[PDB]
Structure 1
């Protein structure tokens, strides 16, 4: 028998390939180069963990920012109210508080914390940030600092201690304490804040409250190392053109 099959011919719309954008939650028709044919993957065990790429784990790690000094013997800058350090608060840290390595005619290489690389891969981002400050000192130094978080400010023009005490802030006393974390709030009229490399949504600043003391037996300089990691609620939004490239080849054609 060779019965005829008269069933009508369906329409169909030719296209050269599958989705270029889709990365998840789908199948991908493809021509695999295997001896086998079928859904096949490379073997694993405990010798080889699972993939470590879950964002919250990468961005939980602190990266380091430019360190800076108190000079306790400095009579000028060591006073009530003098502001030591400050910067706009957003995941991509500001280009001037990162450690840079500059080359002649090449690109400048920035050391960005892991939150700042991840946040360059996405278009919007939101949630709290952790700033862990790390003081080089010994039991004999002492001071107090007021670290305030000012929502809706770009730069320090109108910023003094007497004003900064009107926002969310934390008073910390470095009396035999070498590290503290300041989890800054996230206060913004919008739900996702766009990337920066714009303005940052807020600002952070650090004022001497009680000046630094020390003696003739102890070093007079206290170095501070600021470090930044994402909080527990921090989230990224829409994949975009990465703001940063690799430094493997830093040659550039203007």
Structure 2
């Protein structure tokens, strides 16, 4: 028979597109393949690897070379040799042109897809040298302080007394690595963005300068990592250069986390050029 429905009415919601902004949920698309189900198997391994290459854990732990410096016969007790603010938005200069923003490192590019970050950073120094060089260097991390404020007017380090100190004998060791903790009164810091040097509505966006830690900068970086010399790099100028390069790489620690994905800080292109 053709009986009267006893199926009670349910309330409904009209949405044009659900989970549009979401990694969760069931996409309600129409498929184009003949088979509604058509999916393809997760082939393993893929691109030579079985490691997950799309994992943040994987990506942010890829070493970014981001800076070098010199250590020499010149260099003097307590002379700062090198500093960096500790944060993930580490950048380079484009070759083609000379914009202010610059070319992001991988790390920076990736973190760039989020607003919030936290965690520790793995900094790695390589001392390209021979055995006939001898000298010491102390790596020190100064939380809650910018790279101007770690050195007095003479470029000598200030109050090294008060922090984690890492002595390096070059007679022995040619390389050194360490982890800088996250250190903040906030659970999350913000992925540093370029700031407007000009006044509105004039816009000249430039990378931030963390010479100083105060509440204009404080929530973009934990502090400043500094490499002070202890001895001049004494060597036989007779047979070896009396100055050497020191290379610095960074990757993320295990505890490293980002969140609040949105409009990214960085934007990718197929080529960059000067205007006629």
Bin the TM-score by the shorter chain: 0.7 to 0.9
Partner of 1:58: 59
Q: What residue number does 1:230 align with?
A: 252
What is the aligned-residue RMSD (CA, Å)? 2.4
Structure 2 alignment gaps of length 5 or more: 194-215
Gaps of 5+ in 1: none
Does 1:42 pair with 2:40? Answer: yes
* Matched ranges for 1:11-26 at <5 A: 11-24=11-24, 26=25
Contact in 1 for aligned 2:63/2:249 (Cα 8 Å): yes
CA change 1:110–1:237 in 2 (3 A) is same
Conserved 8 A contact 2:144-2:223 = yes
Secondary structure at 1:4 match in 2: coil
Deviations 1:105-137 (A, max 9, x none): x6765251x322221111111111011001110
User: Using the alignment, how far apart are the partners of 1:188 and 1:139 within structure 2?
Assistant: 40
**TM-score (norm. length: structure 2):** 0.79
Q: Deviations over 1:3-53 (max 9, x none)?
A: 2225454332322121221113x2221111111123x31134435356521
Q: Give the direction of change, closer, same or farther, for the CA distance of 1:45–1:100 in structure 2 (3 Å limit).
A: closer
Contact 2:97 2:272 in 1 (8 A): no
> What is residue 213 of structure 2 aligned with on the other side?
none
Among 132, 135, 140, the residue aligned to 1:143 = 135
TM-score normalized with structure 1 length: 0.85
Is residue 190 from structure 1 mapped to residue 183 from structure 2 by the alignment?
no
What is the number of equivalent residue pairs in this alignment?
242
- Counterpart of 2:103 in structure 1 is 110
Matching of residues 73-92 of structure 1 within 5 Å: 74=74, 78-92=75-89
Q: For each residue in 1:74-117, what CA deviation from the matched residue of structure 2 results, as whole angstroms up to 9, or x when unmatched?
A: 3xxx1111111101101112x4xx3542516x6765251x3222
In structure 2, distance between residues paired with 1:205 and 1:130? 14
Shift of 1:185: 2.1
Alignment of 1:171-190 (within 5 A): 171-190=167-186
